[PDB]
Nucleic acid binder design. Structure first.
Length: 94
RNA sequence: AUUAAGACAUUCGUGAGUGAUUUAUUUCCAUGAAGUGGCGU
């Protein structure tokens, strides 16, 4: 799986919107795979990876063109999942 | 003219006197002002 952030950036670049960044979106794990296009045979497998560690409402992408930014809104695609508490609990004792 | 004639079962008289619709009863039980970060790789 590749996180939805990768395809969010790719879709926005597919339109006449250019995003701020010196490095291309990261693909895979290797040290330098900053690529904009999927490998070759077919597109990567994508999923909403960041949901399992806490559901958000908006994704802000902050276009390079100043004083304007792109907002991606997350909705449950049928009103079933409105929130999700993070499943990790941090504890501080002594 | 005949064991007959006359004669209101009537007068007076408060359904009234005493009496608390009162006693007992928790508008209470359950419920996180919470959830999430995003981009600048």
């Amino acid at each position: 799986y590749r996180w939805e952030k990768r395809k969010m950036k790719q879709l926005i670049k597919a339109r006449g919107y250019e995003l701020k960044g010196d490095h291309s979106p990261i693909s895979g794990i290797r040290e330098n795979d900053n690529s904009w296009n999927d490998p070759n045979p077919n597109g990567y497998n994508y999923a909403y990876i960041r949901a399992i560690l806490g559901l958000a409402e908006q994704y802000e992408f902050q276009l390079e063109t100043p004083y304007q930014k792109a907002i991606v809104k997350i909705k449950s695609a049928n009103n079933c999942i409105s929130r999700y508490k993070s499943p990790l609990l941090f504890k501080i004792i002594n």
